[PDB]
């Protein structure tokens, strides 16, 4: 079975063209067919096209025909998706996916239409707005709800563009009770997002808490140590 690893998030101006890569590792490349599925924010899935790797032939969705191209290079086990003359409606997460088709290099093909293996996706933002790194502000734990009991704390990742931004705690060690909210588009047109976490309050003075923020689109990677 293959493991698909897609390229990073991208911002693209309306009318430009985007090319997304997908690296496949594992099984024999040519024994797989690959598909690109996209999902506009808050919307369902849209099948884009599929390439029959072995024959190097691809078919596409009627509405995207003419401005989309899917390619695959056996030598690098990489599948490519090229979308041209981008528009606002093209803003979405683009997913790479595939399925084993049998011993294709030995005369057989199942022509499976379903998708078993998926990539992590790639967010593509069609916009003319400027990329901007976020500021990371700490949410101080002075906030006590339970009798001592439970304390809350977090980080405010404010004014960045475009999406996405990832947040982790203690380099990934703290995952219990963590709630990272969906990004929100502010009045400014810039995004903001908070990541909070509840921990036993009797540990504020002994346990160190740090949020690990990353906005790859602007090469901004920050670590904010939160203190009460």
């Amino acid at each position: 079975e293959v493991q698909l690893v897609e390229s990073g998030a991208e911002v693209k101006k309306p009318g430009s063209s985007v090319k997304v890569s997908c690296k496949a590792s594992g099984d024999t490349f040519i024994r797989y067919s690959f598909t690109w599925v996209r999902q506009a924010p808050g919307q369902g899935l849209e099948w884009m096209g599929r390439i029959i790797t072995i024959l190097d032939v691809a078919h596409y969705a009627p509405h995207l025909q003419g401005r989309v191209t899917i390619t695959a290079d056996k030598s690098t086990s990489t599948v490519y998706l090229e979308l041209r003359n981008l528009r606002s409606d093209d803003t979405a997460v683009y997913f790479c996916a595939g399925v084993y088709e049998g011993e294709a290099d030995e005369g057989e093909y199942d022509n499976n239409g379903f998708l078993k293996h998926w990539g992590q996706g790639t967010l593509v933002t069609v916009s003319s707005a400027s990329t901007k790194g976020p500021s990371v502000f700490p949410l101080a734990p002075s906030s006590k709800s339970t009798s001592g009991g439970t304390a809350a704390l977090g980080c405010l990742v404010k004014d960045y563009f475009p999406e996405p931004v990832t947040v982790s705690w203690n380099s990934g060690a703290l995952t219990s009770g963590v709630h990272t909210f969906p990004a929100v588009l502010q009045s400014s047109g810039l995004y903001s997002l908070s990541s909070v976490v509840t921990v036993p309050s009797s540990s504020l003075g002994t346990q160190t808490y740090i949020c690990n923020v990353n906005h790859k689109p602007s090469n901004t990677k920050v670590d904010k140590k939160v203190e009460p």
Partner: protein, 214 residues
């Protein structure tokens, strides 16, 4: 174009009960129908193909059924970790021009849980930037319906706050909500009492959290 319809677009069924998701095609697709499960911030996961074949590593509670134009997805013992949007996809036509239904969001209808409230003052670093963000948090509650009221010196604020809600937790089926009041450092400093008044079914009466500037 073969249209795949999934209705309701949303369903709410109790934990431990059996969920029945629906999918129909604008025309016959025989048994070339697949089901996918997509959890928050995750890529779809193949559940069923050939209309009724469980894919590798898929629990037996997930069952495919139907053929032609009418299909059904069943999850016999709904758990918290089952929260997701389920999609059906047909792949019976040729040339290969497959289409997906628009999914059904499956909410786990757990018991009511009151929210735990926390209010956060602006950090000092942000204040240097001439802007102040006051954050209120409603943690692990159910149902999703919640009213957050901001008051500055008992003055009920409005149109100057934004809220964000997490998706149903995969462990306890609860939600978490953040309300962020935004105002100029200038406006902030000429005030003393900031309050967050929460209202939720699990609460006998409105719960408020607050702090005094400084």
């Amino acid at each position: 174009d073969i249209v795949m319809t999934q209705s309701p677009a949303t369903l709410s069924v109790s934990p431990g009960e059996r969920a029945t998701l629906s999918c129909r095609a604008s025309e016959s697709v025989s048994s070339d129908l697949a089901w996918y499960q997509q959890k928050p911030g995750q890529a779809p996961r193949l559940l069923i193909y050939g209309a009724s074949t469980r894919a590798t590593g898929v629990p037996a509670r997930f069952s495919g059924s139907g053929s032609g134009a009418e299909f059904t997805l069943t999850i016999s013992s709904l758990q918290s970790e089952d929260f997701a949007v389920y999609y059906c996809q047909q792949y019976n036509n040729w040339p290969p021009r497959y289409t997906f239904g628009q999914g059904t969001r499956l909410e786990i209808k757990r018991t009511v849980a009151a929210p735990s409230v926390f209010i956060f003052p602006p950090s000092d670093e942000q204040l240097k930037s001439g802007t102040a963000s006051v954050v209120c948090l409603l943690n692990n509650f159910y149902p999703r319906e919640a009213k957050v009221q901001w008051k500055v010196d008992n003055a009920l604020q409005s149109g100057n706050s934004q809220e964000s809600v997490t998706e149903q937790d995969s462990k306890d089926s609860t939600y978490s909500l953040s309300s962020t009041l935004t105002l100029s450092k200038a406006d902030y400093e000429k005030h003393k009492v900031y309050a967050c008044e929460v209202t939720h079914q699990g609460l006998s009466s409105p719960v408020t959290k607050s702090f005094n500037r400084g």
